[PDB]
Design an enzyme around this catalytic site. Structure first.
Site, short mmCIF file in Angstrom:
data_model
loop_
_atom_site.label_atom_id
_atom_site.label_comp_id
_atom_site.label_asym_id
_atom_site.label_seq_id
_atom_site.Cartn_x
_atom_site.Cartn_y
_atom_site.Cartn_z
N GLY H 26 -1.21 -20.11 -2.10
CA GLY H 26 -1.68 -18.76 -2.36
C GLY H 26 -0.61 -17.69 -2.39
N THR H 27 -1.03 -16.43 -2.42
CA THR H 27 -0.11 -15.29 -2.46
C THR H 27 0.78 -15.28 -1.24
OG1 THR H 27 -1.65 -13.81 -1.28
CG2 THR H 27 -1.74 -13.83 -3.70
N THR H 28 1.76 -14.37 -1.23
CA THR H 28 2.71 -14.23 -0.11
C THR H 28 2.46 -12.97 0.73
OG1 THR H 28 4.49 -12.93 -1.14
CG2 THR H 28 4.51 -15.30 -1.58
N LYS H 58 -6.64 -6.53 0.88
CA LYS H 58 -6.50 -7.85 1.48
C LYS H 58 -6.12 -7.73 2.95
CE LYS H 58 -4.59 -11.09 -1.12
NZ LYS H 58 -3.85 -11.97 -2.09
N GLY H 158 2.61 -18.03 2.32
CA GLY H 158 2.19 -17.93 0.94
C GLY H 158 3.38 -18.24 0.05
#
Ligand SMILES: [Mg+2]
Ligand SMILES: [Mg+2]
Lengths: 233, 247, 238, 111, 244, 198, 241, 240, 239
Positions: H26-28, H58, H158
């Protein structure tokens, strides 16, 4: 030839994927098309009621949840009804108790946290249906994109369903225009209508095939059925 | 492989798991016990993992009641906890109803009742231990009892369970008569236990106790006629090795 | 596979459980004083982005009981908690503070129960409890995942068990007693570090290690600074 | 001991005109010998061209109305905004009211 | 054959267990519904194992209320359940509102019943493993949308029809109906219609024993045509064929 | 309270039981049978609290009949009365006791002898030669103590009883509207319907 | 559909799970019960032997269930004790309620009904026991009943269960006069029993017995579980060293 | 290897590895403990022009003093937050004093813990970064699927964690006395940009929050507005 | 696809089907009615006869003074149903005074057989059954059959168990749909001969139980049943 990692909603693939949830999104792509698009004065849902046979009625895809809120769906009727139903309570809880009209951001929260549970426990399966939500709170207009994967995103417009692409693009382009259509409802719709007709293949839309919903600055959520949508064809 | 693993009937009639439980038994440490006309004796080897563990803090022959003690061969842990509940059931389901303590026969059965539960039920593996419970009570006199994980149990004169049973059970078989007094037994026990060892044979490396006679000393009180004292006697490291003299 | 007897009655999940305790990669040793007790554990901090305060494999269970565990941090913090509360509930329900040897019983008991009824997977950690109670003084008892405890006059948990061990064993066949002759803890501490350094073919700075001491009812973790000063102490005297 | 009930005066009135209907009721609100508010409405529209009012004990009163106005709303959700025939509403209220039989709503209500 | 276990999703996102249940309804004897602005008809093929079974014993068509009838197809045991919940759901409503329940509103309840089955439950307890092996032909009349006809499918979904047929020869009729149906069909017309498509895609020589017939109107409510009316109606039928 | 009598004689038992029913002031029915045959040879008269009464009886009745076809063998008066007492014993310590008193008359076929059991709502049983719940005993018990003989014919008993009645009428404040009489014997049950013209 | 689970039904309406257990019996000691117009007999041959086992201040084959009823076991030791226990309880509730002795027919039935219970639900396995019920009640007099794990019970004139009960069975079919006074039976018992043995010969120690009898001098019923002695003796009376 | 409860021949729980495997995917997300208080930042990924900016947050607050963010499976994250929310508010009602960050982690660690014990449940698919203040300073930790967490000087997970890692490495040494509250933000602003260069063909929206007795005043506030802008531009110059 | 609580491709629940396969394995029963009676016939598996004649069981069972039933399949099971039915028979009468309707009864029974085919972790009753009797204050004979799945059905005359197919055939061309067997005597005569196919001589394998209205009932004696075998073999030889 083989794949064992797709047993329950409960098992991870070596990489970190949930095939079961991935499949639910496929049944989402299987159902009829539908569109949503917002601005600053209203929100609109437009959907293609699909019938079984020719001697049968077209299965509706819009639902009200309060004077100010609603949604369309792509997928399994049952699943949808449940979710929308649960939703209905959530608004009511707020109104009675606090006497405040439910904020959409929050409406998505709950539908995330709800559908979420089904991805973590054995026994069940995940929700086979996606929803486009529309509403008008105190932060003006809003529009949501919800997936069974529990992901709810706030957009400006969109489509889901079979051949949902062509509209997503029509929208992607005509954006700069409609986001500015404030004070005029019929305009947002015709716009939305065009965005969808931009995805048909079997044939054009009729009074029976069409369905529209709207909500806004003085426009409590209302739906247009059949001969009432006559004009927008 | 077979229709073994699970709690259900094999084609003939043999119940699955149970037998593999009676395996953790046969593989376990060697232990024996002898009923002997005026006393009863139970013992088991104390094979130390390493000399860095002061093994002096782990009973194998344990006290169930001031008239009953028991012992094992198999899964150490199973015996530890099995005991504590066993003691309670001897209270809740007897002493608190009657005012006194239970006869051998019944306490055993009560333990067996628990041994049972673990079987008739999926989601629970039985106990990997067979118990040798020895005791006495005013009406049935001296008693000897074995208890398998299968729940079942039998009344013995003397016997062994564990690695060295095939053998021991034969040695014991030879050396038994119905008039033997306790010290005869005690002696006899060691000589069986003798062979069944691989390690040492001193005091601290042999666990043994016996049911003998009232210990008016051990009580802590004096003034009540009928309350006279426990019979259960865990011989300590000292009393033992001395009896190593007359072989 | 799964939690119910093998054909030779040895249900391996319990066995497998063990390697994982070890697998962490740290060495824990412990020995008795005369009016104190001590445990050694290594403190290998790789990631230069963490904070050594937050690291440790030894926690203060009670006012007098401490605990070390050679095992995976998540599972340990659990055991830590339950135990930590069993004693808490005990003192309340019975009038007197719970001793070493006992906690280790309900503890082993607990791990046995799990194992037999199947209400969860066993934790892959070996707990080494220490303290000094006024009934048996310097106490040291250890417990494993296969639900089981016993006593040690001085013990060790780690990838290299028997080495740390054998040394002490030999040092014991000679000192002939079943503990460490000496009055001051500082001094005992010195002794263990000593017997460990010698035992690894390795040297430690003032942060590479982790140690605790159990006194006359006042258990405390050895901190970064005081820790170094013992290395000072045991440098020349060697 | 604790007394869970109270009286806030009030008087309401209903007449069934040939092809109309009236539901009147004053705006005073009381406690003992004191005043609470010169103006306080006891008569309400609940939609579907249906008026209600419950006089006796305010709290039990307004709670009933609230509890009802909601039960109207929900009727539309499950039957496609079908209008509630007045006769129906009443049969419905009976139940609501009877729900709390052994701890009633201390009020005379009219629609 | 992997992918056949109730709450399991096919990789094309499909639920076969469900789909097979449908294949159950197939095995049922045929049932046909026809809605006319005059009234609604329900007729079914009987098909009896032996002549010792008392025809009327087969409750393929049943009353759900003075204003709502019904015909089932497929699993008879499962039918009795849906029929009972429905019968109850109806009365209950009347006790609460002193009125009659909207055919679809009723129908809804029944479909609400169907898809309410879990597999250990990821939240909601649903005591009943699998789906229903039966469909329904609900046919009544509320005073908001007049005469109505519905199709109850185990999947928890449904549709409104002008004319529909479930059972063995589903298409054999649906095809036929597809081009026989027209609004201004009178009731007498409709009867002789159902009565024809049955005989055709039916199996044996058509007669009152192998075919139960019923109907419901605003006037009298749900009535199950005795063997006389049916018998003669056969004649007005088998006679017009001779000509054209 | 009401009137409930019973008397065991030679080869039978006899049960008397008033007929009136009262609601505070008026008298509703006055031709009411406070009886309930449990099995072909067992029978039970009763008096007690308004609702408690008729419910309990039928309920007891149910159980018996059940047992009797299940087994196909009939249950003995002795055992019957034991069970009734069981049920009341619990009843008394229940969240709400059935306040009811009873008389149970039956013909034990194995012993070929008639047995009669009196039982109050507290769960108090006793085999008796004759009995009466409530105030009914006070007025009569004497006459019975007097004239009663174990050997009396079925008729002898009626006369006696008849006399007890005449008394109850004469000195009792309440108007019980007469009595229904019934006999249990080796032949079963029949009603002395004649006690109106008699 | 093959072997596993009791809730399973084979393509031919068979419940294997049961049929195994219902057969597991053929592993237990040979128990026999016989009827006479004056008394009932329960004979049984012990198993689990060695030389270091008592049996006097105990038993495990003949259990007294009621002062009027008795049973002969032949299955799983562990199982039996559980049923034996609840069989005793229920019998007492009958007494505590009707204040009378519980009829044999009834008792047998209720038990057969529990065994049957475990024959139909998932999460439990059927009991692997077989019983010879022997008793009296004044309803139908003396009665000999039997039941398997299938939960079926049966009225018998004289029956056997366990080992070689096909061989042993037939021996009975020969000698048996319906009136056959008790002693002839007690005798017959051994005759039948000896003939079906792997032991070099019949030794008292490895044997269990009991009888039921009633009369005018007793006025009631008396039953006797025979003690080590009486046996070692009657054995000689039937001509055995 | 297929069930959650089980162990491998040499003590290993695979389901948890894959859990980890999804966390990376996923994202960082990152976070940094500075002078007094902390600073967080995540990577919202604008997949289309039909996404309202400044919208789908988020990052989430807990109580009124704890920042919090993560990455991996988004609904899993959200879920976990709720439990943390109860625990907090329950504690608060009980002890009055706002919840100590040190323990908080455990409360959560203990909950993430469980989902590694039974087979009927699914391992938590997210790595989580968070922190806040109290009496004895500010703290910052990072919880993984295994349930094991710790205290870091700054954290990251991430997609590209190394970028920010070696990036976080530097800061340590040049500012071995804790970076300025202010500079902390703008620095974080940069550290993100640098680590985004994988989703490079796809534009994005950076989100930032922080805690500090001096700046936030004990609280957790969303870095939005003016400071927010310059913090970007600040990153935009070094972005060369 | 057999371990049912799941569907075959063609929509089958094979377990429920197989269960029926056991009713065939079992003994045999047959019922017949007139315009005044309803007779129930059954056979007797007289196989290992060294057992007291007296107290050992017999197929027909009374459920209430006016109603009885019979079965074929697992005895082990059957018993439990009979019991639960008998119980409901009273629970009704209690809470409704009025004694049970035969139709109702069956529906209850079938509801139970039906209950054992839904929850996983239970298995269907391997029993199919014939239930006969006359409703309270009614003179119309009623016959119903219930089977394992949960279906109940009224028949003019039906048979279950092994070789039912045969006798069924026989019955089919004997029982007049137009008019039912008038007299009781001959209504019996019928049923008896219908069983003589499978019997294989001897009224020693034939059980008859007869039921009339007003809760009358009455099983048959051996000779009575024999005097029929007699008066039938006679007309068979006369043909
Ligand atoms: Mg209405
Ligand atoms: Mg598990």
């Amino acid at each position: 030839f083989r794949n064992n990692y797709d047993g329950d909603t409960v098992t991870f693939s070596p990489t970190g994927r949930l095939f079961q949830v991935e499949y639910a999104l496929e049944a989402i792509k299987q159902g009829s098309v539908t569109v949503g698009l917002r601005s600053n004065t209203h929100a609109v849902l437009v959907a293609l009621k699909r019938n079984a046979d020719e001697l049968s009625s077209y299965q509706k895809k819009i639902i009200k949840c309060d004077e100010h809120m609603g949604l369309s769906l792509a997928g399994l009727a049952p699943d949808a009804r449940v979710l929308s139903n649960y939703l209905r309570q959530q608004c009511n809880y707020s109104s009675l108790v606090f006497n405040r009209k439910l904020a959409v951001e929050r409406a998505g929260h709950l539908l995330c946290d709800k559908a979420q549970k089904n991805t973590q426990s054995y026994g069940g399966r995940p929700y086979g249906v996606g929803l486009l939500i529309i509403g008008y709170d105190k932060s003006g207009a809003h529009l949501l994109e919800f997936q069974p994967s529990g992901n709810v995103t706030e957009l400006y417009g969109t489509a889901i369903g079979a051949r949902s692409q062509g509209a997503k693009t029509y929208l992607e382009r005509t954006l700069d225009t409609f986001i500015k259509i404030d004070g005029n409802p019929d305009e947002l719709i015709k716009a939305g209508v065009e965005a969808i007709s931009q995805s048909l293949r079997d044939e054009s839309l009729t009074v029976d095939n069409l369905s529209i919903a709207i909500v806004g600055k003085d426009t409590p959520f209302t739906i247009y059925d059949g001969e009432a949508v006559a004009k927008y064809i | 492989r077979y229709s073994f693993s699970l709690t259900t009937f094999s084609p003939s009639g043999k119940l699955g798991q149970i037998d593999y439980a009676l395996t953790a038994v046969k593989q376990g440490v060697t232990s024996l016990g002898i009923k002997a006309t005026n006393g009863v004796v139970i013992a088991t080897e104390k094979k130390s993992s390493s000399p860095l563990a002061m093994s002096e803090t782990l009973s194998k022959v344990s006290l169930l009641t001031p008239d009953i003690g028991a012992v094992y061969s198999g899964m150490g842990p199973d015996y530890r906890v099995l005991v504590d509940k066993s003691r309670k059931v001897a209270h809740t389901s007897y002493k608190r109803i009657y005012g006194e303590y239970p006869p051998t026969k019944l306490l055993v059965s009560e333990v067996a009742k628990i041994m049972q539960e673990a079987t008739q039920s999926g989601g629970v593996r039985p106990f990997g231990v067979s118990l040798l419970i020895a005791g006495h009570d005013e009406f049935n006199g001296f008693s000897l009892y074995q208890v398998d994980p299968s729940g079942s149990y039998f009344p013995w004169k003397a016997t062994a369970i564990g690695k060295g049973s095939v053998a021991a059970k034969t040695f014991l078989e030879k050396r038994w008569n119905d008039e033997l007094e306790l010290e005869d037994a005690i002696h006899i026990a060691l000589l069986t236990l003798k062979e069944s060892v691989e390690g040492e044979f001193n005091g601290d490396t042999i666990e043994l106790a016996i049911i003998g006679d009232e210990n008016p000393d051990l009580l802590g009180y004096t003034g009540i006629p009928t309350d006279k004292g426990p019979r259960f006697r865990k011989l300590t490291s000292q009393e033992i090795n001395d009896r190593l003299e007359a072989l | 596979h799964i939690t119910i007897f093998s054909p030779e009655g040895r249900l391996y999940q319990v066995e497998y459980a063990f390697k994982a305790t070890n697998q962490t990669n740290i060495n824990s040793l412990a020995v008795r004083g005369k009016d104190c007790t001590v445990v050694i554990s290594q403190k290998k901090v790789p990631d230069k982005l963490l904070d050594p305060t937050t690291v440790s494999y030894i926690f203060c269970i009670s006012r007098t009981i401490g605990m070390v565990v050679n095992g995976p941090i998540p599972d340990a913090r659990n055991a830590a908690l339950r135990a930590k509360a069993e004693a808490a509930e005990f003192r309340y329900k019975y009038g007197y503070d719970m001793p070493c040897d006992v906690l280790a019983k309900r503890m082993a008991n607990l791990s046995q129960i799990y194992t037999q009824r199947a209400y969860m997977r066993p934790l892959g950690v070996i707990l080494t409890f220490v303290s000094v109670d006024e009934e048996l003084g310097p106490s040291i008892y250890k417990t494993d995942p296969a639900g089981y405890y016993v006593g040690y006059k001085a013990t060790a948990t780690g990838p290299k068990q028997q080495e740390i061990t054998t040394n002490l064993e030999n040092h014991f066949k000679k000192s002939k007693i079943d503990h460490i002759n000496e009055e001051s803890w500082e001094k005992v501490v010195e002794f263990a570090i000593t017997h460990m350094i010698d035992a690894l073919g390795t040297e430690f700075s003032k942060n590479d290690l982790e140690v605790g001491v159990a006194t006359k009812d006042k258990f405390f973790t050895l901190s970064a600074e005081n820790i170094e000063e013992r290395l000072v102490a045991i440098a020349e005297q060697d | 001991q604790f007394n869970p009930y109270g009286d806030n005066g009030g008087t309401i009135l209903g007449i069934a005109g040939e092809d109309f209907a009236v539901l009147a009721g004053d705006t005073r609100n009381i406690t003992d010998y004191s005043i609470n508010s010169r103006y306080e409405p006891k008569v309400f529209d609940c939609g579907d061209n249906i008026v209600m009012s419950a006089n006796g004990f305010a709290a039990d009163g307004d709670a009933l109305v609230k509890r009802f106005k909601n039960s109207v709303k929900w009727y539309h959700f499950d039957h496609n905004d079908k209008k509630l025939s007045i006769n129906s509403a009443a049969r419905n209220i009976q139940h609501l009211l009877y729900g709390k039989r052994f701890f009633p709503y201390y009020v005379h209500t009219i629609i | 054959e992997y992918d056949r276990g109730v709450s399991t999703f096919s990789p094309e996102g499909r639920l076969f267990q469900v789909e097979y249940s449908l294949e159950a309804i197939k095995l049922g004897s045929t049932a046909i519904g026809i809605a006319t602005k005059e009234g609604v008809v329900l007729g079914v093929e009987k098909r009896a194992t032996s002549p010792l079974l008392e025809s009327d014993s087969i409750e393929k068509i049943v009353e759900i209320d003075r204003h709502i009838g019904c015909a089932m197809s497929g699993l008879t045991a499962d039918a009795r359940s849906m029929i009972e919940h429905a019968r109850t759901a109806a009365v209950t409503h009347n006790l609460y509102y002193d009125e009659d329940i909207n055919v679809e509103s009723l129908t809804q309840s029944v479909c609400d019943l169907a898809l309410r089955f879990g597999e250990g439950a990821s939240g909601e307890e649903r005591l009943m493993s699998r789906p229903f092996g039966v469909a329904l032909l609900i046919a009544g009349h509320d005073a908001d949308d007049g005469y109505q006809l519905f199709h109850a499918e185990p999947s928890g979904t449904f549709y409104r029809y002008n004319a529909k047929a479930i059972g063995s020869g589903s298409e054999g009729a649906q095809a036929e109906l597809l081009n026989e149906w027209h609004s201004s069909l009178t009731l007498k017309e409709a009867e002789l219609l159902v009565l024809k498509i049955l005989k055709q895609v039916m199996e044996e020589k058509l007669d009152e024993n192998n075919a139960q017939l019923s109907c419901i109107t605003k006037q009298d409510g749900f009535k199950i045509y005795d063997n006389e009316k049916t018998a003669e109606l056969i004649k007005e039928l088998k006679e017009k064929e001779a000509a054209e | 309270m009401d009137i409930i009598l019973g008397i065991r004689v030679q080869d039978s038992v006899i049960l008397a039981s008033s007929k009136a029913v009262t609601r505070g002031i008026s008298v509703l029915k006055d031709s009411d049978d406070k009886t309930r045959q449990l099995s072909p040879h067992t029978l039970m008269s009763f008096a007690g609290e308004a609702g408690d009464t008729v419910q309990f009886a039928e309920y007891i009745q149910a159980n018996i009949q059940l047992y009797s076809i299940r087994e196909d063998y009939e249950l003995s008066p002795q055992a019957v009365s034991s069970f009734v007492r069981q049920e009341l014993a619990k009843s008394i310590r229940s969240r709400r006791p059935y306040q009811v008193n009873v008389l149970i008359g039956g013909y034990d076929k194995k012993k070929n002898k008639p047995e009669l059991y009196q039982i109050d709502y507290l769960g108090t049983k006793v085999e008796l030669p004759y009995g009466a719940h409530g105030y009914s005993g006070f007025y009569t018990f004497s006459l019975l103590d007097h004239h009663y003989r174990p050997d009396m014919t079925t008729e002898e008993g009626l006369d006696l009883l008849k006399l007890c009645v005449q008394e109850l009428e004469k000195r009792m404040p309440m108007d019980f509207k007469g009595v229904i009489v019934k006999i249990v014997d080796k032949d079963g049950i029949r009603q002395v319907d004649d006690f109106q013209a008699q | 559909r093959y072997d596993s689970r009791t809730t399973i039904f084979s393509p031919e309406g068979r419940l294997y799970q049961v049929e195994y257990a219902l057969e597991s019996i053929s592993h237990a000691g040979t128990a026999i019960g016989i009827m006479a117009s004056d008394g009932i007999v329960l004979a049984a041959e012990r198993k689990v032997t060695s030389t270091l086992l008592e049996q006097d201040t105990s038993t495990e084959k003949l259990y007294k269930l009621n002062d009027k009823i008795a049973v002969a076991v032949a299955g799983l030791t562990a199982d039996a004790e559980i049923l034996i226990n609840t069989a005793r309880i229920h019998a007492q509730n009958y007494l505590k309620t009707y204040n009378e002795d519980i009829p044999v027919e009834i008792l047998v039935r209720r038990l057969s009904d529990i065994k049957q219970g475990y024959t139909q639900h998932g999460g439990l396995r059927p009991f692997g026991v077989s019983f010879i019920y022997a008793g009296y009640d004044d309803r139908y007099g003396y009665q000999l009943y039997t039941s398997n794990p299938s939960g079926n019970y049966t009225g018998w004139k004289a029956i056997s269960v366990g080992a070689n009960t096909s061989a042993a069975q037939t021996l009975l079919q020969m000698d048996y006069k319906d009136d056959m006074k008790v002693d002839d039976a007690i005798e017959l018992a051994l005759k039948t029993l000896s003939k079906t043995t792997d032991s070099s010969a019949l030794t008292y120690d490895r044997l269990e017995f009991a009888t039921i009898r009633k009369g005018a001098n007793d006025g009631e019923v008396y039953q006797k579980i025979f003690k080590p002695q009486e046996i070692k003796d009657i054995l000689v009376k039937t001509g055995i060293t | 290897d297929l069930s959650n409860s089980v162990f491998s021949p040499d003590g290993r729980n695979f389901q948890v590895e894959y859990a980890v495997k999804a966390v990376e995917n996923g994202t960082t997300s990152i976070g940094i403990k500075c002078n007094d208080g902390v600073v967080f930042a995540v990577e919202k990924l604008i997949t289309s022009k039909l996404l309202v900016p400044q919208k789908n947050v988020k990052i989430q607050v807990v109580d009124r003093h704890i920042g919090c963010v993560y990455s991996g499976l988004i609904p899993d994250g959200r879920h976990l937050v709720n439990r943390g929310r109860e625990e907090a508010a329950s504690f608060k009602k009980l002890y009055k004093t706002p919840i100590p960050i040190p323990a908080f982690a455990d409360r959560l660690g203990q909950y993430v813990q469980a989902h590694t014990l039974y087979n009927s449940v699914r391992p938590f698919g997210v790595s989580t970064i968070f922190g806040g203040v109290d009496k004895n300073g500010a703290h910052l930790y990072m919880l993984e699927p295994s349930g094991s967490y710790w205290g870091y000087k700054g954290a990251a997970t991430g997609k590209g964690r190394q970028s920010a890692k070696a990036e976080l490495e530097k800061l340590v040494d040049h500012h071995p006395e804790g970076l300025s509250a202010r500079e902390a933000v703008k620095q974080a602003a940069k550290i993100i940009y640098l680590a985004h260069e994988d989703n490079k063909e796809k534009d994005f929206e950076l989100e930032i929050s922080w805690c500090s007795l001096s700046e936030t005043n004990g609280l957790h506030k969303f870095v939005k507005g003016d400071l927010l802008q310059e913090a970007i531009d600040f990153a935009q110059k070094e972005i060369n | 696809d057999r371990a049912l609580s799941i569907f075959s491709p063609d929509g089958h629940i094979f377990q429920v089907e197989y269960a029926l396969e056991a009713v065939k394995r079992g003994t045999c029963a047959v019922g017949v009615k007139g315009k005044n009676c309803v007779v129930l016939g059954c056979e007797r598996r007289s196989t290992l006869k060294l057992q007291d004649t007296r107290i050992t069981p017999s197929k027909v069972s009374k459920i209430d003074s006016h109603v009885v039933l019979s079965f074929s399949g697992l005895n082990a099971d059957s018993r439990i149903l009979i019991e639960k039915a008998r119980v409901e028979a009273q629970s009704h009468r209690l809470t409704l005074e009025d004694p049970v309707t035969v139709e109702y009864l069956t529906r209850y029974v079938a509801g139970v057989q039906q209950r054992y085919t839904q929850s996983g972790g239970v298995r269907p009753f391997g029993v199919s059954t014939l239930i006969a009797g006359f409703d309270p204050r009614d003179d119309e004979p009623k016959l119903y059959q219930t089977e394992p799945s949960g279906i109940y059905s009224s028949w003019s005359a039906q048979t279950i168990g092994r070789n039912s197919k045969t006798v069924r055939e026989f019955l089919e061309k004997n029982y007049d749909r137009k008019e039912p067997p008038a007299t009781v005597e001959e209504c019996v005569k019928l049923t008896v001969r219908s069983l003589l196919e499978v019997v294989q001589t001897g009224a020693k394998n034939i059980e008859i139980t007869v039921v009339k209205p007003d809760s009358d009932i009455v099983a048959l004696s051996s000779e009575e049943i024999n005097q029929y075998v007699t008066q039938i073999e006679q007309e068979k030889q006369e043909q």
